[PDB]
Amino acid sequence: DMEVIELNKCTSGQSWEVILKPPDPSLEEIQKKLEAAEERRKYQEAELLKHLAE
Amino acid sequence: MYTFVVRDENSSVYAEVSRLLLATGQWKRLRKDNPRFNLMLGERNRLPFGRLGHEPGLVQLVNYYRGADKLCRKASLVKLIKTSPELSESCTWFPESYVIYDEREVFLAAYNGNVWIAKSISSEASELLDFIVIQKYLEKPLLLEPGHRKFDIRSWVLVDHLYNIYLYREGVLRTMFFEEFNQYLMDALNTTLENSILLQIKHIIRSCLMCIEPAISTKHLHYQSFQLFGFDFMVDEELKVWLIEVNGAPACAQKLYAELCQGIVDVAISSVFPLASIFIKL
Amino acid sequence: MREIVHIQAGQCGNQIGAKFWEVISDEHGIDPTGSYHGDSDLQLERINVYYNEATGNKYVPRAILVDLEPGTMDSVRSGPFGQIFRPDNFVFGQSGAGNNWAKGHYTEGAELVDSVLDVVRKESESCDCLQGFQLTHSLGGGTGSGMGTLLISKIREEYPDRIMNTFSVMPSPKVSDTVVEPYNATLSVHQLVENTDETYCIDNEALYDICFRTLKLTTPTYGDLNHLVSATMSGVTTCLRFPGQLNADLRKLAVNMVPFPRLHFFMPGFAPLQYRALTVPELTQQMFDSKNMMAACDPRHGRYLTVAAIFRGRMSMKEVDEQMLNVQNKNSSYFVEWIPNNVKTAVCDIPPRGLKMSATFIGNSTAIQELFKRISEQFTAMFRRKAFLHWYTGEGMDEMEFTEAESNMNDLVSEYQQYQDA
Amino acid sequence: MRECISIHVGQAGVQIGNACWELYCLEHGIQPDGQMPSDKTIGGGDDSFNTFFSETGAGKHVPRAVFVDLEPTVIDEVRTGTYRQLFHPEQLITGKEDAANNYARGHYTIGKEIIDLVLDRIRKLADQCTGLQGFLVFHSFGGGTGSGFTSLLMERLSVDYGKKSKLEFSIYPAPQVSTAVVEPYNSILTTHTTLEHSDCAFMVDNEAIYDICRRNLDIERPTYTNLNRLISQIVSSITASLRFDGALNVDLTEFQTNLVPYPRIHFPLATYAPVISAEKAYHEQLSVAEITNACFEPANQMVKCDPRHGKYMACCLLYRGDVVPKDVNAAIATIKTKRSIQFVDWCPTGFKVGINYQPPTVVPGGDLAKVQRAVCMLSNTTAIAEAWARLDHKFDLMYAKRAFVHWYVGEGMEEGEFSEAREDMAALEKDYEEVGVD
Ligand SMILES: Nc1nc2c(ncn2[C@@H]2O[C@H](COP(=O)(O)OP(=O)(O)OP(=O)(O)O)[C@@H](O)[C@H]2O)c(=O)[nH]1
Ligand SMILES: Nc1nc2c(ncn2[C@@H]2O[C@H](COP(=O)(O)OP(=O)(O)O)[C@@H](O)[C@H]2O)c(=O)[nH]1
Ligand SMILES: CCOc1ccc(C2=Nn3c(nnc3-c3ccccc3OC)SC2)cc1
Ligand SMILES: [Ca+2]
Ligand SMILES: [Ca+2]
Ligand SMILES: [Mg+2]
Ligand SMILES: [Mg+2]
C-alpha cells in the first residue's frame, strides 16, 4: 500500500512523492591563513639565500 | 602467473589451499598489504570489501561473501528466517527460536516436554532468562547403537562466483563418515543415507542460500566472491533433519583436507583463473 | 609559454649536447641553416619550448655553449648543425680545466662564470614564462663538472623559483680519461643533491656495455656512446616538445617523480637499441630489462619509487596499457607498496627517425645507490692515501671539503637503502 | 525568476562545463552565436531558461558561468571554439603557470594572486541577478587548481555570499584516468576545507565512467570527450528541474532539503540509465520499469559501491521523456520485492519523483544514441563511504612514509594540515558507520 502525495502537473512535466513506509570564518581569518603561509615561504627562501651566501 | 595474498594466519583450511597454489607453479604469494593481487584470503573480522575490484587490469577474487554474516550469526539467522517470505515462521526444518536481549513476551506465550536452550539448557524458563537467543532443545534426538549416544552432522558447502551451490560428498558426524554411517542405517533402520537424511540436508542448504542470494550475489559487481560454509544439523528419532547453525569460517576433517581443499581450487579458483567431481551440484 | 634555457658545459656536455640538438632538429624539421622544412603542424605547436623564433622566421636553439677551452666548441661550430646556434651564446675561456673540479669551480671557472650568466639572463628576459634550466655535462671532468655545478649554484641564487634539470654523465674505470674522475664526481654529486630537482644518471659503463654486449661493437668510441644519450634525451623530452594528453611542463615531472628532496636521481632507459618492427610486448620487456638500463644498476637489486614511461609512434594504446600493467603485476616485488599507482604511461603519436616505434624509460629506483657506492669505493681508495690531492690543494681546497663530500654522498646512499627495506 | 551562476575551476571543471553548456544550448535550441529562435521575448524575460542564461539587446543568450584556470592552454580552446560568440570575454579567466598537481601551490601560492580578480568577475554577473540562488562549482579532487583554488574560492563565497547555497560537481580520482600520484593528497585536503562550505556535492568517479564507456559504448580507450559528454547527461538531468518548468528541486535549496539530512553527509550517490551506443543500429527501447530497476545496478552508478550493504536516507527519481506516473509507481513496488532497499529508522521509506516530457538530447555525431526515456537516481546511501575508505587508505600509505610532503611544505603549507585533514576524514567515515552499519 503506497501513497502518492503532492502531485503537481505542468506543460514541461509533472512530479509527485510516493511513500512506502513511515519512519564560517570571516574575511580577516582567511587573510591570516594566506599571509602566514606567504611569510613562511619568504622565511624558507631567506634561509636558502642565506645558505647560498654562506 | 597469477598472484594471491594471505590475510588470515589462523585459517586452517586455506593454509592448505595456499599451499597447493604454490605447488602449481602458476601462483605467486605476495605481501599482506600488496594491492596488486588476483586472489584474496582475507580475515574474518572487518574485511575491506571496499578496496576490491578497483585495480586496473586485475580480476580480483575474495574467499568471502559480503553480507553472509546475516546467516552465520545467532541472532541474525533467527531474524533472517522469520522476516523472509520464502522462509517465514512456518519453517519445518528450523526449531522454535527467540531473540532475547525483543521477543521476550512472545517467548513466554509459547512456553506456557518443555525444555529449551540458550546460546550466542534447562526446563524452567526463569533460570534461562536469568543467565542472560533461545532455541527449542530437541528432547528426543536420534541415538546410535551401540552406545545410546547423541551426534550431529557437518556438511561443507562451496559456492563459486556464479553462485553455483556445491555440496561435498564426504561429510562427518561429531558423535564417523558417510560410508560407515550409511551401512548402519541399512542394517538397523533399513534405509539409505541418501534418502532419509541427505535429501533434507540438500533442501535446507539450497533454501537458505537462495533466500539471501539477491542480497549477496556478485554477478554484476566489480569483484567476484566465493565462500566455503559449514552447516550443522540435528536428527531426531523420526528421522527429521533440523538446522542448528551456519559457520562462516568452518574447519574440515583431517583425512578430508587433501580432497576438499583441492576441489576448492578447481571449481572456485581455477574457474576464474584457469591453469596451463567431488561435489554434488544443487 | 614554457620556455627552457639549455646549457651545455665542457667537452663531454657540448659533444652530447650537440647530438641532442641534431636529433630534435630532425624531429621538428629544422635544417642546419635554421629554417623549417617539416610536414606536420605538430612539430611547431610546441617549438617555442627549446627554440627562439628569429627575424626571418628561423628557429635558433635556446642553448648556451660553455667551456674553458675552445677545443670542443669549435668542433661543434664546425659540425653539421653548428651554424644554427646563436653566435653570442658561445662563451669560452682559453686556460682550460685540465680535468680538475677545483679549477672549474673555484679558480679558473669563477673568472668566466659571470660571463655565462649574462647570456643566461638575456635568454630569460625573452621568456614569456621561464619553465626551467636544462644542463648537460659530465662529472668526471673539470669544466662540465666544476663550472657546471657552479652555474647551478649561481642560477639558483638568481632564479630560486625555477626548476633545475641536469643530464649528468657518470665516469667509469672502463671508459676513463684520468684517475681523478671519482674525485670530481663525488664533489659534483654533493652539489647536485642540494641544488638540483632532477638528475638523469647516465653511466658511461652502462653505455659501454650496451655498445659492446648488445650492439656488438668490438671497439666503442665516444661518438657511439653519444648516440645512446642523444636518443635517450630525445625520448625524455618527447612530451615536452610534442603536444600530448598529459601537458608536460617539467615542474609536474619534479612533483611526481621525486618523493623526497634528496632522492631525485633517475635511471634512463631506451628501446630498441634493424628493419623488423618491434611489437608492444617486446618494447616493454626490453624497456625494463637490465641490458637497456643506462645507469649500470640492476633494478632487481632495488625497488622502484616512481616510474615514468613514454611510447612514441602509432600503436594499440589499449595493448600498451595492458603490457605496462602486466609488468607491475608480474614484478610487484620491485615496486614500493606505499606509493599507489607509481607507474604512469603516456603515448606520443610521432616516432623518432629510424624507428617506427620506440620506448623511453625513466625510473627513480633505489638501486641507483650502487652507482654512488661504486664511486665511493673508488674515492676512498685514493683518498685514504691522500693521492692526487696536490692538484686540488694547490687550488685553495682543503681535505675537510673532500671529507664533507664523502660523508654527504655516503649519507645519500643510506637514504636509498632506507626506503629500499620499507 | 531566480538566476544561478555556474563556476568551472581547473581543466576538469572547464572541459566538463563545455560539454554541459553545449548540451544546454541544444536542449533550449540555442545557436552557438547566442541566438535563440524559440525565445520570443528579445532582450528580456523571466522564463525557466533565464536562470542559466542572460539576454542582450542583440538577442544573444549569454550563459551565467565563469571559467577560471591557472593555465590558459585549456580555456584558450574555448576562446577559439565553436561557442566563441556565446561567452563574454570577461567570463574566461586565465593565469600564467598552473598549480603543477599541487594543492598548496594552487591554494596558497598562485591562488592568492588571482582570487581577488575572480570574485570581482563573479560580482559582475551577480549584479545582473534580481535574485541569485547560489552557485554550481565544477572541479576535480586530483588537480592542483581544481582542489587548491576551489577550496579557497568556496571560502570567500561563504563570506561574500553567506545566504547563498553552493552545490558541487566533483570528480573522484581514478588510477585508469589520472595525471598525478599525489592526487589522494589533493583530494583529502580540498575535502576537509570545502566540507564546511558545501551544501550538496555530487561525486563522479572516473573509474565508473571509464568502465561505463567501455561496457555500454564498446569503446576500448574512452577519451575525455566521451567522458564529458556522458557526465553532461547526468548534470543535465539534475539541473533539468532548474532550467525547465517543474515542482521538484526548482531551486538550489530543495537539493539540500530532499537529499541532505545531515550537513556533513552531503554526498548523494548518482545513478544514470540507460547508456546506449550511437553506433548500434538496432536497439530495443527499454521501458519505464526496466530503466528504473537499472538504477540499483552498481554498473550504472557514478561511484562504484554496493548500496545493498548500506542504508538509504533519501532517494529521488528524475525521469526525462515518454514517462507516465502510472508506470513509475508500478516499478517501485516491484523493486522492493527483489532489491535490498533498507532505509534508516528515522526517515520515511519513500521516493520523490520528477518527470520531464522532453526526451534526453544527445550531441549530434556523438557516441550516445537518442533515447525516448531515461532516469537519473539521486540516493544518499551510506555505502558511498567506500569511496572515502579507498581514498583515505591510499592517503595513509604515502603519508606514513612522509612521501611528497616537502612539495606541499615548500609552498607555505604546514605539515599539521595533513593530520588535521586526515583526522577530519576519519571522523567522516565514523559518521557513515553510525548511520548505516548496525
Ligand atoms: N571527467 C574528466 N576528468 C578529468 C578531466 N581532466 C582531468 N580530469 C581528472 O582530474 C584529475 C586532475 O586533472 P585536473 O583536475 O584537470 O588538473 P588541472 O585542473 O589542470 O589543475 P593542475 O593540477 O594545476 O594541472 C585527473 O586525474 C583526471 O582524472 C576531464 O576532462 N574530464
Ligand atoms: N658519453 C660520453 N662521455 C664522455 C665524452 N667525453 C668525455 N666523456 C666523459 O667525461 C670524462 C672526461 O671529462 P671531460 O668531460 O672531458 O672534462 P671537461 O669537459 O673539461 O669538464 C670521462 O670520464 C668520460 O667518461 C663523450 O663524448 N661521451
Ligand atoms: C610515477 C609518478 O607519476 C607521474 C605522473 C606524471 C608525470 C609527467 N610526465 N613527464 C613530464 N615530463 N616528462 C615526462 C615523462 C618522462 C619519461 C617517460 C614519460 C613521461 O611522461 C610523458 S611532466 C608530468 C610523471 C610521473
Ligand atoms: Ca687567469
Ligand atoms: Ca526571454
Ligand atoms: Mg677532456
Ligand atoms: Mg592544467
Q: Do A25 and D354 touch (CB under 8 A)?
A: no
d(CA C168, CA C188): 9
Measured by CA distance, the residue closest to atom 12 of ligand 2 is C141
- For the CA of D74, the closest atom of ligand 1 is 20
Which CATH number is B156's domain given? 3.30.470.20
Amino acid at D380: N
Tell whether C160 is within 8 A of chain D (Cβ): no
Q: Do C339 and D406 touch (CB under 8 A)?
A: no
Chains B and A are in contact, defined as 3 or more C-beta pairs closer than 8 angstroms = no
Which CATH number is D424's domain given? 1.10.287.600
Confirm if C166 and C200 have CB atoms less than 8 A apart.
yes
User: Which residue range is the domain that position B38 belongs to?
Assistant: 1-63
Are D130 and D187 within one domain? yes
Resolution (A): 3.8
d(CA C203, CA C224): 14
Confirm if C359 and C365 have CB atoms less than 8 A apart.
no
- For Cα atoms D85, D89, D92, give the angle at the middle one, nearest 5 degrees: 110
The residue with cell 568452518 is B250
Q: What are phi and psi of C165, to 5 degrees?
A: -125, 130
Please, what is the end-to-end C-alpha distance for chain C in angstroms?
Answer: 40
Q: Do B221 and D305 touch (CB under 8 A)?
A: no
Are D136 and D255 within one domain? yes
Question: Which among D242, D244, D319, D247 has a CA at the least distance from the CA of D288?
Answer: D319
Confirm if D147 and D140 have CB atoms less than 8 A apart.
yes
Q: Do B57 and C329 touch (CB under 8 A)?
A: yes
D5-9 and D65-69 strand pairing: parallel
Are D66 and D14 within one domain? yes
Q: Which of D213, D242, D268 is the last residue of a domain?
A: D268
Question: Which among D17, D374, D372 has a CA at the least distance from the CA of D229?
Answer: D17
Return the HEC string of chain C: CCEEEEEEEHHHHHHHHHHHHHHHHHHCCECCCCCECCCCHHHCCCHHHCEEECCCCCEEECEEEEECCHHHHHHHHCCCCCCCCCHHHEEECCCCCCCCHHHHHCCCHHHCHHHHHHHHHHHHHCCCCEEEEEEEEECCCCHHHHHHHHHHHHHHHHCCCCEEEEEEEECCCCCCCCCCHHHHHHHHHHHHHHHCCEEECEEHHHHHHHHHHHCCCCCCCHHHHHHHHHHHHHHHCHHHHCCCCCCCCCHHHHHHHCCECCECEEEEEEECCCCCCCCHHHHHHHHCCHHHECCCCCHHHCCEEEEEEEEEECCCHHHHHHHHHHHHHHCHHHECCCCCCCEEEEEECCCCCCCCEEEEEEEEEHHHHHHHHHHHHHHHHHHCCCCCCHHHHCCCCCHHHHHHHHHHHHHHHHHHHHCCCC
Cell matching residue A44: 624558507
Tell whether B3 is within 8 A of chain C (Cβ): yes
List strands edge to edge, sheet with B116-118.
B97-98, B134-136, B116-118
Residue C283 CA from chain centroid, whole number: 22
Residues, beta carbon < 5 Å, ion ligand 6: C 11
Are B47 and B69 within one domain? no
Tell whether B54 is within 8 A of chain C (Cβ): no
Domain C368-422 in CATH 1.10.287.600: yes
Confirm if C250 and C3 have CB atoms less than 8 A apart.
no
- Please name which ligand lies nearest the alpha carbon of C101: 2
Residues of chain B contacting residue D304, judged by C-beta atoms under 8 Å apart: 53-54, 222
Annotated binding residue at D386?
Answer: no
Give me the number of domains chain D comprises.
Answer: 3
Question: Which among C89, C34, C93, C92 has a CA at the least distance from the CA of C64?
Answer: C89
Q: Do D348 and A23 touch (CB under 8 A)?
A: yes
Tell whether C245 is within 8 A of chain B (Cβ): no
Diameter of chain C measured on Cα atoms:
61
| HSE-CB for D364 with a 13 A CA cutoff | 3
Chains A and C are in contact, defined as 3 or more C-beta pairs closer than 8 angstroms = yes
Task: Give the single-character DSSP code of B267.
Answer: I
Confirm if D371 and D359 have CB atoms less than 8 A apart.
yes
- For the CA of D70, the closest atom of ligand 1 is 24
Q: Which of D225, D247, D268 is the last residue of a domain?
A: D268
State in Å: Cα C130 to ligand 7 middle. 17
Tell whether C349 is within 8 A of chain D (Cβ): no
Are B26 and B83 within one domain? no
d(CA D411, CA D421): 17
Cβ density class D177-191: b for 16+ within 10 Å, e for less = bbbbbbbbbbbbbbb
Tell whether C127 is within 8 A of chain D (Cβ): no
Q: Which of D268, D297, D318 is the last residue of a domain?
A: D268
d(CA D192, CA D198): 11
d(CA D256, CA D198): 10
Q: What are phi and psi of D97, to 5 degrees?
A: -90, 150
- For the CA of C228, the closest atom of ligand 2 is 1
Q: Which residue of C has its CA nearest to A41?
A: C161
Tell whether C401 is within 8 A of chain A (Cβ): no
Helix axes C10-27, C70-77, angle to 10 degrees: 20
d(CA B109, CA B96): 13
Q: Is C316 exposed, middle or buried (0-12, 13-18, 19+ CB in 10 A)?
A: middle
User: Which residue range is the domain that position D406 belongs to?
Assistant: 384-438
Confirm if D380 and D313 have CB atoms less than 8 A apart.
yes
Measured by CA distance, the residue closest to atom 2 of ligand 1 is D12
The residue with cell 575474495 is B62
Are B45 and B71 within one domain? no
Confirm if D170 and D139 have CB atoms less than 8 A apart.
yes
Which CATH number is D59's domain given? 3.40.50.1440
Torsion sign (Cα): C296, C302, C307, C313: positive
Confirm if D175 and D207 have CB atoms less than 8 A apart.
yes
From residue D51, alpha-carbon distances to B57, D125, D251 in Å are: 44, 12, 10
Question: Which among C102, C96, C85, C205 has a CA at the least distance from the CA of C145?
Answer: C102
Which CATH number is D351's domain given? 3.30.1330.20
Confirm if D165 and D252 have CB atoms less than 8 A apart.
yes
Are D304 and D430 within one domain? no
DSSP-based three-state secondary structure for B33? coil
Torsion sign (Cα): D227, D230, D232, D237: negative
d(CA D236, CA D234): 5
Confirm if D268 and D259 have CB atoms less than 8 A apart.
yes
Q: How many CB pairs below 8 Å do chains A and D form together?
A: 102
Annotated binding residue at D130?
Answer: no
CATH architecture label of C1-259: 3-Layer(aba) Sandwich (3.40)
Pocket, ligand 1, Cβ cutoff 6 A: D 10-12, 15-16, 70, 98-101, 106, 140, 142-146, 171, 173-174, 177-179, 183, 206, 224, 227-228, 231
- Which residues sit opposite D169 in a β-bridge? D138
What determination technique applies here?
X-ray
Measured by CA distance, the residue closest to atom 20 of ligand 1 is D11
- Before C272, cis peptide (omega within 30)? yes
From residue D87, alpha-carbon distances to B126, D33, D51, D117, D130 in Å are: 80, 9, 16, 18, 20
The residue with cell 535446507 is B204
Neighbours of C239 (CB within 10 A): 24
Please, what is the end-to-end C-alpha distance for chain A in angstroms?
Answer: 84
- For Cα atoms C163, C165, C170, give the angle at the middle one, nearest 5 degrees: 155
Tell me which H or E stretch contains A39.
Answer: helix A27-53
Q: What are phi and psi of C336, to 5 degrees?
A: -65, 140
Are B13 and B89 within one domain? no
Residues of chain B contacting residue D393, judged by C-beta atoms under 8 Å apart: 48, 51
Write down the CATH number for the domain with range C260-367: 3.30.1330.20
Cell matching residue C303: 625497488
- For the CA of C247, the closest atom of ligand 1 is 25
Helix axes D224-238, D206-215, angle to 10 degrees: 110
Residues of chain C contacting residue B33, judged by C-beta atoms under 8 Å apart: 337
d(CA D91, CA D181): 32
Please, what is the end-to-end C-alpha distance for chain D in angstroms?
Answer: 45
Tell whether D3 is within 8 A of chain C (Cβ): no
Task: Point out the residue among D96, D100, D398 whose CB comes nearest to the CB of C255.
Answer: D100
C343-348 and C202-203 strand pairing: unpaired
Are D105 and D90 within one domain? yes
Which of B28, B30, B33, B36 is most worth mutating to test chain C (most C CB atoms within 10 A of its CB)?
B36
DSSP-based three-state secondary structure for B251? coil
Which CATH number is B40's domain given? 3.40.50.11480
Confirm if D149 and D68 have CB atoms less than 8 A apart.
yes
Question: Which among C237, C307, C240, C231 has a CA at the least distance from the CA of C271?
Answer: C231
Q: What are phi and psi of B171, to 5 degrees?
A: -105, 175
Cell matching residue C343: 607507474
Please, what is the end-to-end C-alpha distance for chain B in angstroms?
Answer: 32
d(CA D146, CA D138): 8
Are B146 and B275 within one domain? yes
Q: Which residue of D has its CA nearest to A36?
A: D412
Are B144 and B73 within one domain? yes
Tell me which H or E stretch contains B172.
Answer: strand B172-173
State in Å: Cα C16 to ligand 2 middle. 9
Question: Which among C95, C201, C109, C89 has a CA at the least distance from the CA of C151?
Answer: C109
Tell whether C319 is within 8 A of chain B (Cβ): no
Are D229 and D356 within one domain? no
d(CA B32, CA B30): 7
Confirm if C272 and C278 have CB atoms less than 8 A apart.
yes
DSSP-based three-state secondary structure for B61? strand
DSSP labels for B83-124? Answer: H-TTT-S--TTS--EE-----HHHHHHHH----EEE---BS-
Q: Do A18 and D351 touch (CB under 8 A)?
A: yes
**Residue D430 contacts by C-beta under 8 Å, 6 or more apart in sequence?**
none
Cell matching residue D252: 538550489
Cβ of residue C127 lying under 6 Å from some atom of ligand 3: no
DSSP-based three-state secondary structure for B142? coil
Residues of chain C contacting residue A48, judged by C-beta atoms under 8 Å apart: 160
Measured by CA distance, the residue closest to atom 13 of ligand 2 is C141
Cell matching residue C16: 652530447
Question: Which among D295, D297, D290, D342 has a CA at the least distance from the CA of D317?
Answer: D295
Helix axes D416-435, D385-399, angle to 10 degrees: 150
Which of D77, D211, D407 is most worth mutating to test chain C (most C CB atoms within 10 A of its CB)?
D407
Cβ of residue C246 lying under 6 Å from some atom of ligand 3: yes
- Which residues sit opposite B122 in a β-bridge? B116
Cβ density class C191-227: b for 16+ within 10 Å, e for less = bbbbbbbbbbbbbbbbbbbbbeeeeeeeebeeebbbb
Cell matching residue D258: 530532499
Torsion sign (Cα): C211, C214, C219, C224: negative
Give the gap in angstroms from C-alpha B45 to the nearest C-alpha of chain D. 14
d(CA B105, CA D301): 44
Q: Domain extents for chain C?
A: 1-259, 260-367, 368-422
- For the CA of C145, the closest atom of ligand 2 is 21
Cell matching residue C143: 669544466
Cell matching residue D243: 532550467
d(CA C404, CA C407): 5
Tell whether B59 is within 8 A of chain C (Cβ): no
**Annotation says D254 is catalytic:** yes
Which of C256, C304, C343 to mutate to test ligand 3, by most ligand atoms within 8 A of the CB atom? C256
Virtual torsion, Cα C222, C226, C229, C233, nearest 10 deg: 150
Amino acid at D62: V
Return the HEC string of chain D: CCCCEEEEEHHHHHHHHHHHHHHHHHHCCCCCCCCCCCCCCCCCCCCCCCCCEEECCCCCEEECEEEEECCHHHHHHHHCCCCCCCCCHHHEEECCCCCCCCHHHHHHHHHHHHHHHHHHHHHHHHCCCCCCCEEEEECCCCCHHHHHHHHHHHHHHHHHCCCCEEEEECEECCCCCCCCCCHHHHHHHHHHHHCCCCCEECCEEHHHHHHHHHHCCCCCCCCHHHHHHHHHHHHHHHCHHHHCCCCCCCCCCHHHHCCCCCCCCCCCEEEEECCCECCCCCCCCCCHHHHHHHHHCHHHECCCCCHHHCCEEEEEEEEEECCCHHHHHHHHHHHHCCCCCCECCCCCEEEEEEEECCCCCCCCCCCECCCCEEEEEEEEEHHHHHHHHHHHHHHHHHHCCCCCCHHHHCCCCCCHHHHHHHHHHHHHHHHHHHHCCC
Measured by CA distance, the residue closest to atom 11 of ligand 1 is D142
Catalytic residue among D254, D290, D417, D429: D254
- Before B141, cis peptide (omega within 30)? no
d(CA D155, CA D317): 32
Annotated binding residue at D10?
Answer: no
Cell matching residue D264: 556533513
Confirm if C285 and C264 have CB atoms less than 8 A apart.
no
Neighbours of D99 (CB within 10 A): 30
B224-225 and B61-62 strand pairing: parallel
State in Å: Cα C8 to ligand 4 middle. 22
Annotated binding residue at D144?
Answer: yes
Cell matching residue C296: 649500470
d(CA B197, CA D170): 58
Confirm if D437 and D203 have CB atoms less than 8 A apart.
no
Are B88 and B224 within one domain? yes
Give the gap in angstroms from C-alpha C193 to the nearest C-alpha of chain A. 14
d(CA C51, CA C374): 38
